[PDB]
Each structure stands twice: as C-alpha cells, then as structure tokens.
C-alpha cells in the first residue's frame, strides 16, 4: 500500500535521538535522525544548525549508525573534527579523528554552543499539568 496511517516523514529520516542545548536563560532541543552523517554549522543543509553569528558551516560532522544486536537496537555516535573554529568534547579538546560519543555526552562547538546528546528510544514524560498550550482546531477557543 502507498497510503499509510499517521504522519509520514518527508525531509527528516527517522527520529532516534535528540540534542539539548544548555543556555543561561533557556534551553533548546533538537531531533537527530539516523542519516549516517550529521552536519553541524550555519548552513541550513547541515543536520544541526547552531545559533552563532560566525558558526562554521562545516564545523563538525557526527556519524549516526543504527544496528540490531540480540534484539534491542543500539546507536553509536562518532565525533570528527575538520574545522578551525574550536571544538571541545567531554570538556576536553579532541586529539584524534575517531572519538566515540554516547548518551549523556557534552559537546561544545565554537567555544559557546554547548549541548548534551542522548538517545530517545521512547522518552517518558507523562506528567499531569504540562506548561504548554495545545490545540487541535483553528480560529476558535
């Protein structure tokens, strides 16, 4: 069948994980797909577009691969440096070109943009009173 239920992806591959940016005054969450290669920079084409006036377009690239072992699928991210703007991972400067990134990892790009990466297989957030307006209709209520 060509027609499927629910919403289907068009530009975004498949949601797997997300990146939370730590900013003094607010936070930002970005969804990451399993495109094998994630781009970070000013270019809109990049997987993750930072928020810097002089953010490197080719700043850095992250490899997102998904594999199935035993039964549960595990994801692994690799940190690679190919720019001259300044990239600090895990609070330390990268020396090699094959760093392994895992859940709860802090990454800094440009010496200002810092975000934490984690896997979002299911993500539980069942509360009672969420702080956010949610509507289904328009021009009403």
UniProtKB/Swiss-Prot annotation:
Coarse class of the protein's main subcellular location: nucleus
Record bears the keyword Hydrolase: no
Location relative to the cell: Nucleus
Post-translational modification remark: Autophosphorylation increases in response to DNA damage.
Residue ranges annotated for the FHA domain, each copy included: 38-94
Function: Transducer of the DNA damage signal. Phosphorylates SML1 on serine residues. Cooperates with the PAN deadenylation complex in the regulation of RAD5 mRNA levels and cell survival in response to replicational stress.
General remark: Present with 3480 molecules/cell in log phase SD medium.
Name of the protein in question: DNA damage response protein kinase DUN1
Source organism of the structure: Saccharomyces cerevisiae (strain ATCC 204508 / S288c) (Baker's yeast)
Gene name in the database record: DUN1
């Amino acid at each position: 069948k060509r027609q499927q239920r629910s919403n289907k992806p068009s530009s975004e591959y498949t949601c797997l994980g997300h990146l939370v940016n730590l900013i003094p005054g607010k936070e930002q969450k970005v969804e990451i797909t399993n495109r094998n290669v994630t781009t970070i920079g000013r270019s809109r084409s990049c997987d993750v577009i930072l928020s810097e006036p002089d953010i490197s377009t080719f700043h850095a690239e992250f490899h997102l691969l998904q594999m199935d072992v035993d039964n549960f699928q595990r994801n692994l991210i690799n940190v690679i440096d190919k720019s001259r703007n300044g990239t600090f991972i895990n609070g330390n400067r990268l020396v090699k070109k094959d760093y392994i990134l895992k859940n709860g990892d802090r990454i800094v790009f440009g010496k200002s943009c810092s975000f934490l990466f984690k896997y979002a297989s299911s993500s539980s957030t069942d509360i009672e009173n969420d702080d956010e307006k949610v509507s289904s209709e328009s021009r009403s209520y």
